[PDB]
Structure formats: C-alpha cells, structure tokens
Amino acid sequence: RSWIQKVLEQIMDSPRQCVTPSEVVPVTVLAVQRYLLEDEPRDTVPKPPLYCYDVTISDGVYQEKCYLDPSLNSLVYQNILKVGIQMRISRVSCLYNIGQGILCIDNVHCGETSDSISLETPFRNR
Amino acid sequence: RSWIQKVLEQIMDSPRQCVTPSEVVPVTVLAVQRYLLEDEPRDTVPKPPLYCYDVTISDGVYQEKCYLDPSLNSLVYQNILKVGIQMRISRVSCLYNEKRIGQGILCIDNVHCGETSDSISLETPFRNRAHQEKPERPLRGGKSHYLALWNNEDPYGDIWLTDKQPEEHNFSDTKIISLSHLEMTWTNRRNFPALLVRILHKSKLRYYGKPDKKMIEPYQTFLEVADSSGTVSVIMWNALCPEWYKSLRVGLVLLLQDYSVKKSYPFRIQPVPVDPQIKLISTMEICLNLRDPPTNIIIIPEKQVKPEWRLPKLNHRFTTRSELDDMPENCICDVIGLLVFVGRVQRSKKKENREDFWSYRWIHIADGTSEQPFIVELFSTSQPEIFENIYPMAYFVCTQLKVVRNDNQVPKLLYLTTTNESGVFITGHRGQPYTYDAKVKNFIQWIRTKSDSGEQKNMVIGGYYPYPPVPETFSKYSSSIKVESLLTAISEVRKEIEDLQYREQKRIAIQGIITAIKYIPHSISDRWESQGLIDHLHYSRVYPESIPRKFMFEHRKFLSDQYNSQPAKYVPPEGRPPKLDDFKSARSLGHFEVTILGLNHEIAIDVAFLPMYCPEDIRTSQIDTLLTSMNYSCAYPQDTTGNDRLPGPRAVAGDIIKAATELDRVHIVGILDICNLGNNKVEVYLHKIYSP
DNA sequence: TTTTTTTTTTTTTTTT
C-alpha cells in the first residue's frame, strides 16, 4: 500500500545494495532540513560536502524522513529540491547510522509544484 | 650434404636476387604459419596480401624455416600447401632482416606442391639455431609474432603464456574504491586508486593490426569485470593480452592497479549481465596497458576473498530445448548437454575485411527435454584447444548464445549463435565446474539414467550439414536474396567454384532442367534420363569427408582430425591410422547424380544430390518434397530403432528417381551448396529443387 | 581504437 512501507520492506528483504525502488510514485517533499556532516572519512580526493540534509517525503499514507545522499546536495543548493515540489526517487538504500533504519535517497527526479500536499499524514516511525 | 645448405650457400651473397636452385630436391613441409605482411610497399595497384606465410621445409639432414613470397599465398588459401606435403622449390632468394642479427633467410618464390611424404621426421636438427629460439617468432620483423593459420581470433604460438597463478596480495593498506566512485569522480582524480573487480564475461580476442601502422601485439580483449554493484567493460591493450588471456577465466577476482580511465568507445556494446540489480556503468571504461612493473594485474585467490565485501557472483542463464521453443528472437542464453553432432570448420569471409575469415562449426547439443538438439552455430571463441577437439560423446557447455529465429519459412529456424562473450568448455563426468547449477544437475542425472537404461544416442561427426534449410516458397527464397543475382548463371558455376577458399561455403541457385539422375547406393530402377552443348561441368563428385560418419570412441582423435581445421605444424601419426571409409555412415540413404540442362540448352552441369532425410521422414512426411536435402528436423536420425518396417532406403531410391522424372521439362530453380573441402577438392551438392 | 607522466589546498576557539 504505502510506497515508503513497500520500499522499506523490500530493501529489508533483498540485499541492501542500493536497492532500486521496485515501483516509483511521485512523493511530496514536506521539509528540507540541514545539519553538519559528522562521522565521514573526509579523506577522499573529492572531499565530501560539509553539510547534509534530511528531506521529509510524504506518499499520502505516511511521512518518512529520509537522509539525502550528500552527492545530491546540488539539488538543494540550487533550490531545486524545496518544500511543495513532488519528486520521484529512483534509488534507495537502508543505512543503520541499529533500530529500524534510515531510508537513504541515492537518486531523485525533482518534479513540479504539488497541489495535494498533506500535513495530516502521521509519521510511520515515531 | 643437403639441399638447404647448398641453396643457402649458393644464394647467401646475392640478397634480393632470384636464382633458380642448382638442384631441385623435394622437401617436406613440417610447419606453416601466418603473420602480417607489414613493411611491404602498399603503393602497387595490386596491394600486396595483408598476410604472409613462413614454411618450415625439411630436408633429410636439416630443416630451415623459409619465407614464402606473398605472391604464393594462393597455394595456402586453397590449402594446397599444407603440412606433410612434398614440394619442389623452383625459385629462391636471400633476404636479411635488418632488425635482427642473423644469417640470410631463404625466400621461396615458386613451388610445385606434390603429395604427402612417405617418411616425415620430426627429429631432424635445425641448421640455423636462430630458427630454434624457443619463443618462436616470424623470420621478418623485429618483434613480430605468428597468428593462427586460418582465423585471427584464435591464440597461436609461444607468445601466449599460461603460467599465471593466484597470488596472495595483502590488503593491509590498499585503497580500494568502487566503480561508481570513478563514475562520479574520474575526470578530477589525478590518480586512480586500486580496484578489486571480478570477471563476469571474457570476450573473444580481436586483432587490430593493420599492415602500415607500426604496432606490437595488436591484440585487444574486452573483459566485463564487476566490482561491487558496478560493472564496466575493461579492455586490455597491446602486449598485455598475450600474457593474461590464456590464464584469466570468468570468475577470477582481479586486483587492477595503475590503470587508465577514458570514455566508452562509441561503437561499444556492453552486454547486459545475468543479474539486473547491478549498475551498468557505460560512460567510462578502464584500459589496462602493460606497465613496467607487473603490479597492474594481480589475481587474488578465493580464500583471500572476503564476504565482508560484496562481489558479484557469476550467474548463468542455462536453458533447455523446450524453453528455447518459446524464447523470443534475441535472448542471450546458456546451453548444456551431450554433443550429438559435430560439423566441419566452415569459413565465411568478413564484410569488414575481405581477407579475414570466420571459423564456425555447426554442433548439436542433446538433452532430455526434447527430441531435437539446440543446433548451435559455434564460432571460434578464442579457444582452439577445445574448439578443434570437441567430439560427440562428451559433455559440452557453451555460454552467451543468442537466439535466432525465422518464421518466413515453414521449418522455423530456431537455432542459436555465439556472441562475442560466448565461452566454451567440456564439463567433467559429473559436471564438476558447473555442478552447482540445477540444470546442470538435471542434465547429468538424465545422462546417468539413460546410460543406466542401456541406451545410446546416435552420435555423428562432421560431414555435409547445410543447416540453413532453403524454404519451400521460392518467392521467400528470392526475398532473402535482396538484389544479389539469386539465380547464378549456368556457366558461372566454374568461376564461383574457383573463388572459394579453404573450407569456404556459399549458397547459389541455378536454373535448368533435370537432364538425368543415377542413384548411388550408400551401401525400382537404378538410373533414368529425361532427354551436344557449348560446355559441361563435371561436378557430381561426393567426397568421403562429405559423408557423415558414426562416432566410435575407440577412434576419436582420428575422427576429430578428419573434420578439424588444417594443423599448422606437423604431428606424426600415433601408429597406423584407420580409414575413414571403415566407419559406418550416419546417412540412411544413398546420394544421386542429378544432371541439369541449361534453360537455353547450351550449358550443362553435373551436381550431386545428397539427401539427409531418412525413410522415416518420407513416411511421416516430415520433409518438404522428394527433391529436398534437409528434413524439417534437420537432425540426423535418432536411431530410435535403427531399422524399421518402413519402405527400405532402396525403396526410397527409385522413388526419388521417379519423383525427379515427374519434373521432366518443368522449369526449376535448384539451390546448390558449393564448398571447397581443401586442396583442389571442391564439393557441389543439391539442396532443394524449387518447382512451379 | 589506442594513449604516457608530475602537486598542490585554504582556513578565529576553548573552560574541567
């Protein structure tokens, strides 16, 4: 039923090797919040971004907070990934940075402004 | 003392001058190799051949590796100049290699190739020790190498090493990144860290050595290795291929370092792997050139492998005949089963280069899921040791086979082809290398059960097997021939037969009337006629090699060598061999000598009709007509009973004669396969007599 | 298809 539920159970069942969402449905961004990127190797030649973000998607059933891949920080730098806009994830992982997990977004296709953004959908994870 | 010594002493002091040898003594050919003809002037209107040949003629005393003047390559294209033959050199010349310190080279310039020698000695000493250098190389050139005698996709010579073994490289402080990491960051990484990849597909060799450009080992192989989720088409360059190709098998965990990353070649077609979950990185490709230190390629043993990391396992798409019955046009698949037929080494000219050739051989793989085999089109997969030596009574597995279907004709052409990444192997008695697969287990169980039932399959080797069956609709046959002169001239057959090279195949159509037919029992009237021409062709000769032979394990090397490709070097017979005729013929009915009259009653031709259908076919009406050469099964009789209560093959004979008699003056377009079996022997056989 | 070597990078916190 719920897209986030299906994705979570799928990545739990199949190996969590950047599982591609079996089904892709537009999802509405409800929040984009930033914090410092701690606990990173920071030794690669392409040094990682200093800050990371935690998008808050909503599939109409539940709203789940997802840790955006730092590689996709340009989309938020350019204000292409803002509130309201409905996106379409194309890759997902299951990080454990553990209790339940941290649904990670490895790719996304930012869409157009949504007309049915609901602030009433309860959080799947309390 | 010896002819070699006398001629060399006579012509040593006159380089690049042609002198008839003082004495013409027959000399035995002990080896014939082929390599590129660079360094020749490509300004002559008749551009010199793209390849030259070296022949190791042997006298009674010594054998001195000579050089065949490229103008004589015609004698090798027709395989008239083969190993074990006796020839009488008529013209010689001396050439000195200016990139090597050595003596003169005998330059063969005219020969009169005769017949096989009575006594061939493989122990005659080498006059010039330089010719005996263990890493054998061509006489001309500095760092040249010999290619395979006929095809260019088969490793040949001593440059190809098999010494590579697993090495235990410590992973203490090795910086290993993922393929996706390069995909995202390879245009900014000044240095590319180490990698830990695993081979998924290994491609067939590819020779890109043009004659003018100066290259060393123009050999290039594409390996689809996958580290973690990512997969890229690694491509080895230059002289790296002949140091790692005969050793790297699919499924070896490679550790590549000091590599290069570039853009994917525009005309590259990366093959999809079995697992879809992986990422197919198709933007950048890793190039492995030969670095001065031998650390660029290091293979780590499976024990050193750590499940702690994720490495893509080698999967397969094993399919049975029943599954193939429904598989679509193009769907790459793997096949396994008991070989039940082996064809000949047919050669088809490449459209890219009219001088190069392919080397395919039609094979049949048997299984328990159907009464028909897979009918695979097996090209040379850069595995001569297996390709040449395959025989029916064994377990054979081929991977990455592309389905090919054609419903334009009634007998659906459900057969397979070998793609670039297709590999060949002969599994053990129990199937040890592929035992892990379930389909492999099923096949082994089927073979064990059938053997425990005291049953054997009809095993056939070589012969005349034109798998492609010409349709029943002459209109469709013409449609497949798009403005290519579908009907060859009755007087052109001579020229076409003169154009085929060694084991070349070609299909043409002739227009004429059935002059007559004489039945030739394989061993009811025996002969019949329909009834002064401009000229007539006598091509109704069926060679012993053309008749398929029932396989007997006791004599397997002999049978496999009678339908293989001609060897490059000599190998003395291991005793007195048997005769090909003493082996029973898999054909159940004899051939015919149908003679065709030209439409204008001016040119005639003699052709042989060698049917493959059994009396069971003419009873069950599995064939198209009585003038066809292949049954709808296109499979040699399964010998379910060997001999049935059906009309005997002698009855089918005479019946075919009268069937032809029906086509007394009927205008027909017969499809006549023409092939050059070697030497000057050429076969012209009938396929199907299209009638209105 | 060919095709190798080289490095460059600046900046405002802690006290127990």
Swiss-Prot record, chain A:
Q: What is this protein called?
A: RPA-related protein RADX
User: Where, per UniProt, does this protein localize?
Assistant: Chromosome
Q: Which residues of the full protein are shown?
A: 43 to 171 of 855
Taxonomic lineage: Eukaryota, Metazoa, Chordata, Craniata, Vertebrata
Q: What does this protein do?
A: Single-stranded DNA-binding protein recruited to replication forks to maintain genome stability. Prevents fork collapse by antagonizing the accumulation of RAD51 at forks to ensure the proper balance of fork remodeling and protection without interfering with the capacity of cells to complete homologous recombination of double-strand breaks.
